[model samples]
Target: SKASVKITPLGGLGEIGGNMMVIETPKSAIVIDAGMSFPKEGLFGVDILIPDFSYLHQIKDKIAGIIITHAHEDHIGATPYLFKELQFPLYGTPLSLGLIGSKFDEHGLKKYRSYFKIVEKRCPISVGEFIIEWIHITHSIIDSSALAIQTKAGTIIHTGDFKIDHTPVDNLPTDLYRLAHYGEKGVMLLLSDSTNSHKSGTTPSESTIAPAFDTLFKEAQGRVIMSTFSSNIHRVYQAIQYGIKYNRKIAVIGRSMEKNLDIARELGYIHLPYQSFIEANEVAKYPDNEILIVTTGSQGETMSALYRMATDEHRHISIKPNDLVIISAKAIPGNEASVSAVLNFLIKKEAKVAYQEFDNIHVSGHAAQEEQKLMLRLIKPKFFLPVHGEYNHVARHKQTAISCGVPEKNIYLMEDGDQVEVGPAFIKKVGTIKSGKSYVDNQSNLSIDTSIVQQREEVASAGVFVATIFVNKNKQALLESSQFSSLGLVGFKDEKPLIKEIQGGLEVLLKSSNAEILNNPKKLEDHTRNFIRKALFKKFRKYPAIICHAHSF
Candidate 1:
């Protein structure tokens, strides 16, 4: 009713993905960064997390267009795959738009390039009751910007995943002056990135890493291959820009990397020397100074170009002994094993590869403790919320804010589904909304409850037998039934007879009870699952997935 700003973190607290937030006022609502998380430890084969936009869905019309702060997957990846649920035009800088355009092209998204308007730095765009301005900011990727928004209440600065990399590969340093200007005006709510809030000191600029790559390149004998974050345009440019200066011809390897380069180049947001992109296989045809190879998979993605090459699987480039491989990106938290595995394989093949742990090949893209403090001090908001990190990261950020004079209660430690209302009355806590994760496997709705999946996983790894006795209209066991199943334990060949017996037994029970399964699917489902779980646990050391099917009129 009165002047207000509500904050909710959909992801990046206690976890390292899905960075989404919703801010609301009586007249205008702006949802920022609906990114998705990668599959973690037990996810096995899962897609991603999308915030339940039910609240936004109800007020879709009043929603100011969604604003994108940057284009990292955690910051920008899931939009094309998940955004069909609601169609709100996306707004960001040119590179952000280019990367999104690339994603849209990859997924054949429904929207055309024209659908999103590119908000250049220094330009102000208005949507509903929010006055939004985009200011240039240097980050791991190009075209990153900080959002400055104003409502009747006060100004808010959302430092979208930023760092103070003064010597960035790009000419523009972070717009600290603009940030300071807003501080001069007065900021009410300052939402900052907490990815590096626990760490001390400022992040190194891109200039510091060129020499690391330079030495690796100068002494290489066989083909030199480097894999980094394709979306990290600064790294991409630094890698290639360095390659060209040292007299090397560049060839794009991964399909996504190639596609991004083509689009970013066309958009004028980035451009490699026109002559630099050469055919990859022609590496041997050129001198040591004549060729440099670029590809994707800093995260050790199975399908990435680097992974393919590691296993002698890449289509265009293969690693040979004496070849230097520089992994120019930090290991994404969940991807450590994959990255290490790739390194081992490459090392075994006799190729020299440089990685973050072994060398200064990578640096922080988010600001550290002091830089975060600087932004919070500069923006100087009335209330603060930490953005872009997991729970521990956010909690640590709360400590950082508290150290800077923000009251303990003023900094809300928001998790996914948490809703903190900051209207009048010194931004009091209001209430929360429906928030939980739903998983999809090839479009089949898996259990939305994570705990159920965990139980299923446990049952699968162990083994169990289940017996189901169905009762028809007459309430009699129509057939004898028992089933055995082992997930990671035994094979289907060993459990088939048991599973068959259980199915047959369930049929008997249904017939005996006349459950009318044909008329009541819900009751049948509940009965089948519960029956299977209870019976299986009673008979075996581990639980097994129980299945039951019944048909009736």
Candidate 2:
């Protein structure tokens, strides 16, 4: 039988983040981008969500290594979580590895550093039955790359999140020559980022935002506070340059912002003189106009530095009338409300907030429609798959691919866990594997089961009712009155009537119980819980989580 490659995306197909994919041959497999996503509005205590690794576990013995495209949370955020369960060689550029290493240290997976296998741009490495090359690409972050994988079937080009910025911060744009080289060699499949498929025209170059930063810095009368995604090293570097150009001392706030800048500096991705930066505590020592504060929380995360500073919760920093706060990033989808909340707080504090209204303040890192078409035209693959977006985004990308001349029949829109096989002759869905999300609580860095989250949702919505009852085992009769407590339920004007009614009803239930129910506390507790659930539903049309502790003497 001819060798064929199977591609299965575990996440980032029907959603914006949690990007993961498994590529497999008959005897070997490699996983890509174990990323994470923010939990939705009602997830209670869940801090983030990661792709379930059940399919990977099912094929554990066949796995070779985990390939990372960049350092974005949507590309490498879940590495430590995956490493906790399975071990594999990790491969990426230095900047990507540096950020991931810091994440590992935080997660207490520092020991897994042994798995790091750093690769350079255009350098192809042999892993299992596949030959992989990382091609430098322009993105919000430094050292981002597109992957070129050579399998027995054919060459596959995966354009990891990208924007074809002609003039980027570092002066190195997307390596179109490498992409063209692979295109000429003939590509079997092309999996491109679909994030900006809905947007038209070319995505603006990162350099375009410089003029806005220049104008804002020139006009600012006081301290300039800048906030953006920490992983966007290029964006951070640009803002810092403007601060330096304006003769302001940089003071970085937020742990993530500090850590990312430190890594970028140590690796030479960015450079800043030691004396150029001042301690967060020393902001007050310098005149307001002489300081530039770069921080996290562009998304308005509650614990983020910007949020704390806006709310006057930060020990050393507070918003002042003359301050100009530059929020140099767009609110990622699903985060508009929180972003607006932070804006409101900043405005209420009388500080000048520079955000979306200033057109050039922020630019996206994904390819827009024309750029997406350019990628499609450059790769010119026989089969196309749109990835790294929601279903609608990918669906739109398929249309772009068709416009770029990829055959309609040759393209397939995939969702998470749809296993599709590609060979020289064809590309088609063959089967599916187990795939979903695992809710994670950031404090303990542990995954909470879906069932537990569901139970929490139920309790949160309908409330909980806990009751304690005591009975005589021999007589099968109540020995004392039942005690009841509730949370989240609607409080009656006075709770005495409801409690009394439930106690009387429980007494009748206990007296009528058979010996099997009376002698066994578990059975008796079940009966009591069911009775309360029924009584509550009958009275209030609500079924809360019920717990009954029945004691038999």
Candidate 3:
């Protein structure tokens, strides 16, 4: 048991975000990433979702530190929340630490700043039971890496969100030399990104977007507005680089986009002169062709800066007929509708809009099929676990690995919480851990359970009914004054009869209900709710949530 190593994925298996994984020995454990994902449609009012930390609490003392592989939100966004509960040192590259520091600052977690351990590329450091080495890899965000973790059982190569960008803007390609070094040492398990596994061919270089930006800016007769993910420093950098070349001053809008650009430039991950950048309020001071705006809202979020400007709601900027808008990022899976809506608004404003129809302006940071094969071939591990995507993507990556000579049986399509044991001689799925989402509201920085979400969804879909009933403490049957209210519920035509039927039902239910149930008003509330719900369902064919306040004398 001491020599056996266990791998457990808490999230980022069946979904694209919330990527956290655990590697453990008998005496020690370390978390790979603490990432967050955006909430889906059914999670009402939820801003983001983080991996459940129930399993972490079970082994809290054994956890040594948290290691981040990149600066993307999915990899580092949830750390401050995790740190709020479990204080552990965090280790990552300089840029990653810089970004995380900003998040902690926003959350007012000043104590975590001292917990950062800045590690560099190719350097190996011992934390607890594991020795971790950071291997530089190219991604949409600068300073991304793949981790080569050494354990007592064997070595694990965790390729944390990477692509083979031979022509990265920074001129630093994925560190093939270090990967090949691990490959030569005979890797035990390899966990690779499966995001673009469904796509064939290699991903285009980051440099390919510059020419596209150049052409767009040169031909534009008015201000050029470019929008992308704030985390994509290289993409924004390319836009700014071209903006300057075309003699336009850049204005960075959106709080997150500006914050990230400041960090990127401060940490030397990106280079842009302060003189070339101006404030958002200063847009009208210059000629149309002399201004360039980089902002958020590539996903079509209504509150994003680009959307506000597109809809003529921005306080400092308005869309002009001669303005050129370029959405330089692809819409996230669930955001296609939002993105399209923003584009439609911009076009209706008579501004020129460029999107996917144009080539190279927006290239994915994930490796495609050929590049996935290349990673599998280079690592050549005895065991493979596809990560950072949904089930179909992991399954697709498994086939890509098989094509690269890794045995089909050695590859696993793991879901969240699945635990696997890998030793020198054998690898097998042993058990599972508690894994799920913790829905959060970003402004409040609070986690809400799914029960509340379900209630909200029910209220939105089926409508709501509320009642106030009063009873005596000695288990009296009914009340003097009762109040009723409903939201979004439409029952039988001219429903005065329905109210009377419900009143009659309430009296019958109160008489039939046990004296013990009426001992406490709280206890009677559930009974009243169920009675009202059953009555409505019988009459209207729709079951709506009923809330009741029972007053006991």
Candidate 4:
């Protein structure tokens, strides 16, 4: 019996977020984490980037289900988008599904809610050729899990983003016992997170931040404004507890923060009476010292609640002097400038900013070097694949894994679309598959193709020119006084001269053109567009997007 499993990573290899992978045998396939990535600067009008499902489409018939590891946007954000194209059973814990259900409701995918199959920790469920168990894990977010996937080929362990937080906020640490049980049972492959592999020692426990919050709450003279990743319920709950202890009224802001809080409360991950919370509108009624505003925008997103408040655009709340604004999150790479902008805004408003100066004000959820080694020691798999970060991160993790006694030949570094085949004895890269990103406009929840994005970039950088020409139908001659406009092309002082020169050039060209060439409006417009493009390029060495409208009277 020749039994082997093929593993393909569609995303979450060379970059953060957009985490997706396929575990496949000849007969069945299972996807893990339909995630999305945030767009970097210069991707104008693009809000999110999801992994291209071309490969998944190819294996659509063999796919059995999509297993969600957690509810973080990077891990679960693209599920709704994936479901829009393909239908499969969605498996996760209650909080993960609850958050995904909310996303579904937002995306009008609520009808697919029936596809959800909630699983309990350590309980194995069969989905096609694989028996998978969701092993509990501790991370920034609640209800996170690791997976033990058993197939005829062998057992594969995927440690979905985690840290060993023994003193987790909920007192339920990572299920090390279950992980060890599988390690003893003989594992084929171990795919683990490499997010914080560069950092030394273990990551600080989530519970360690409570004292910082308590101290900050005690010293806040006015309103205590806190912002963090909305999905981090334990962090938010810790702050809320401190607010309650200090007798401050809690006001939650931001759409995502509010929605996640509601789901966390509904799923029993967070417990607070209705009376403990106050609406954003009611925030003004209480004294400054008696209010605690928990908002989004730790990344300094322009539209988030904290940004709006800092800019005085929020209807109910504005940053005031003596207020303590605690940005309880680190700037994810590529967002340092935006975070600095938000900090500048708060400082301009005279509010005290608590951002990186304090030790425990923020803590990462990813395991550091020591924890990574610990996981490698615990799993002790025959093969290792480090995932969930850029090239440098995973490469660093490979070194960590080798130090833990895994053979260098048994490990393979993979990027998106790399397909690796694993059998009882060996693992090797087999081939590549179709994999890329689908740029999305989040407001419309629709994807825009790469060509369109390229056009937008061209228009933005080179500018635009609009020209309207009137022609005499009977004589096939150009009429006097054409309309022209240029934006981002030339200064206002130079606009008139440039337009005049173009008009003179157009008159000469139209006169030189034969009657047959001028008779057709389509042909005439094309000619006019080309003329203007050449005229601009000759003068400024740039070709702006040219639009020409020829009206025949």
Candidate 5:
């Protein structure tokens, strides 16, 4: 029998987040990383967007389990959602599972806790048609790994969002030796991260950030406030180390930041003396120079700790003059505007701010062009597929692979839903599969109904208009006390002309229609709703939702 394996990407192609992929033999299948992405701007009211699981519904029974590489939201944020639909054991390192467990707790999925199969580095597990080995790798998040998945056909190496950090915070560099072991044997396909493929040089080590933190702590005259991705424990650990050195009490703000640090410390991934920490409300008891705050708003999320503090909305803390604010994170792509807005707000409050404008304060955790080349050279796979970035990112990595002596034809630049079959004889993009996004709101932890998503965008962009008209028994439209109100319109009562125009349009609808139509309550309501909607669109090019009510006595 000819040996072949099929791979299909549910997401993490042609986009920055929502990473997922499926590997299958004819009889068995497994999923990698059920992640989610933040909604793009203008997708109003959407809390997060996940890959459509329509395809997975078809193959749910065939899937043996789901494997997690790390605990980053982009790698595991959507796991709880996936669990709601299907049941499969989750496999990951201790920290990865620990972080995911927190999410499960939030979603009331504690019942699925028994489904977690915690594995460690170098441990190989057999699941159906594949034998998988979790190889330790260095990344922003601790306990990250790449996979050496051996199937009946051949071995495949999947680098799950990694960087080669020689001096990682934990002193455990990416397991190069194990990756090299597979390289020597032979890999059928090597899937590597493409996030930093456009950057020119190797990414700096996580250890390189400590000196900057040290300098900031030594020079801070007042309180020091730092913010980063809560998941980057190494960055937070470095900041806490400097806080200790400078004799400042660390006050971690933001629910996520505090929870992640607690988990990390409990797991022994971080080592901070218990006395070094202070409660957020306890900040005022210490001198300004004796305090340090590690917070959550590096991305400028409106509800995040940093944003609340910037707007003077955080109950326990407010910005003060001479406060040294160190943003120890890079803005994730699409978050630059929010990050900049927060910077402006902090500077306006007279705080000294250090951000990406200075180097080493925030280093990336993905391989750059040279490092991508190194991975390619080390793996020496017969086939290469770039993963974990947008189309341009993966495309750039494909070019870098060509430069490293791999034949251009051997590299596949895949997009979401593209299914490829690989074997000894050939590798080909055989077909396309169903794929899309599931938009969800955090309140319900369920996909927001599509109609609501569209209505939210409409109301946010155009506004809403409501009208109530009472019809008497004579069938004459009663105009005595018509009600008109609009929300999200361009101006308030001061812009009376636009309001009058809308009111006039409603009057015309009430008069121009036939008497028979006016008496028909359904027809009147439908007519008035359509009339107002069309008038607004025609005059302002905005399609505001129109609600109408016609009552008869």
Candidate 6:
């Protein structure tokens, strides 16, 4: 079994949301990423959706490490959440590690009593039956990497979320030559990023965005406020360098940005000048062009600092016409409309604003068609597995590989569970894995009911009915009580009789109960739940997940 190699994706295989890929050999296994996503428009009130990695739980002992390509939440956000359940060595470049450490510190997760190992660019190490090396790749954030694994089957390149920018913000461009060198040596598989595969041409370089900020920084008459993802440490550094050049006093306004700065500082990744932090109040004292405010919420996150400022909800700050606000971030796919709405609010305030679209304020981190072609050319691998994007994106990437002389069949477009077994002479689909997202809320912490999201959705949609039957331990109803509240459930203000009927029904369910139904914990819960599920549907014509917790004290 160790003679052959298998590559499979648990998530981020055919979508931009969650980015995870599992690589397994006979003796060793490793995961590329563990990430999360938010629910689509509906789905009740689900906050986030993290890809299920229970597949790894079955083979946890074989997992040697978990590696990250960059620091974006969509790519690396669920690290602390996932690692707590599945412990393994953590690997990433300096900047990626810094961003993760910052996230860890915020949730006070360092106490998980775990270790995070920082992998340097070009450093070769082993993870299972493979020798892995990190190839420096230029991206939105600094210290991003493209992994090269030398296995018994052959050499394979796993391009962690990346773009090939000649002039990146950090000036450490992607190493295409080294990638090609390994390719010349002979590669069995090449699983490249397909996030921007559908888009034509190459993505604009991060350096292009700098000039606009420079011009705005010079022309602004009052305060300069910039909003971006806190994980964009390179962008932050670029803004800071601009401030230094212009002799402006800089102060971080967003809690997230401040937190990230601390993480980078602690890990020795960010080199902040002596006593760099200045108070926001101090910015008021400085003249126009003498102050800078770097903030969060470039994606129009409702609670982010920039949104708070737009709604005039901030305690001490107010927007002025002369203020220059730079939104140096791209809106994730579905959030573009909302993010644009936030920008419109700023435009109405007469706040001089700049955003992505026509402005050079933001650049994507995912490689474009040309860059994809470049990767294919550089790593002349035998097989290509286009991943980390939606179906269309993955398809386009596959087409790109075929156009570059890679046989159409050699380009594998796989789903989450399909396994591509790579061996010396041939590759085949040997097996599959059971993978899906699990709902983790307060209720599931006690035990996985599997219907937590279903119940939460019902409550959010049609409100909820909680029938409390205060029964004595003797299986006699002590009192008939009920509580009903509408969480966008029903518009009717009057449901007194309906509520009363449910209460009466609960008392009826306790009519003929045995000791098991009375004292057996699960049986008691089952009876109560069944009683409500039926009675509520019959009378109210509404079906909600009826949760019953019985207690006698």
165-256 per-residue lDDT for model 2 (tens digits): 98888898888999999999999999999988888998778777889889999999999998665565677788888999989999987677
Top candidate, metric TM-score = 2
Runs off by more than 4 Å, candidate 5: 39-47, 297-303, 357-362, 440-446, 449-451, 472-481, 494-512, 533-542
Give the whole-model CA lDDT for all candidates, comma-separated.
0.68, 0.83, 0.81, 0.83, 0.80, 0.71
In candidate 3, which residue pairs get closer than 3 Å at backbone N, Cα or C atoms, i.e. clash? none
lDDT of each residue in 1-553, candidate 3, tens digit only: 4467888999899888789999999989999999988644211122578888889999899899999998878799888888888878899888889989988998899878999999988999998989999998988777788999998788999995888888888898888999999999899999999988888888888777778777888798998988665676777788889999988999987687788889888888778888998998888889999999887642122226666777667777788999888875433566555667777788889988888733332476788898888888888899988999999999999988988888888888889989998887677899988888877775567788666887678678976777888776564677555667776778535355676678777876776778888886777898888888888888778877778888875
| Candidate 1 residue 356 C-alpha distance from true site, Å | 2.8
Worst 10 residues of 6 by lDDT: 38-47
TM-score per candidate:
0.82, 0.94, 0.90, 0.93, 0.91, 0.81
Candidate RMSDs in Å, in order, are 5.1, 2.5, 3.4, 2.7, 3.0, 5.2
Question: Which ranges of candidate 6 are over 4 A from the true structure?
Answer: 38-48, 105-114, 262-272, 297-303, 357-362, 438-451, 466-487, 492-553
Model 2 lDDT, residue 408, Cα: 91
Per-residue lDDT, model 6, residue 64, is 89
Clashes of each: 26, 0, 0, 0, 0, 4
**Residue by residue across 169-245, what tens digits does model 5's lDDT show?**
88888789999999999999889999888889888877777777777787899999876655656667788889889
What's the lDDT for candidate 4?
A: 0.83
Please give, for residues 1-553, the per-residue lDDT of candidate 6 as tens digits: 4477788788877556677888888778988887755433111122355677778888888898888877666677777677667778788776566667665675577764256787777779876777889888877765677889888778888885788989876567778788988988888888888878777888898888778768877777787877665566677887887887788888787676776767666776667785555877777787766878887642113325566677788765667788888775433555555556667778888888766532322466678889989888888888888888778888988888999999887877788788888776676777788866654331122223236767556466665655444556664443335344333334555556666666666566665666557665467777877877777677668776566676543
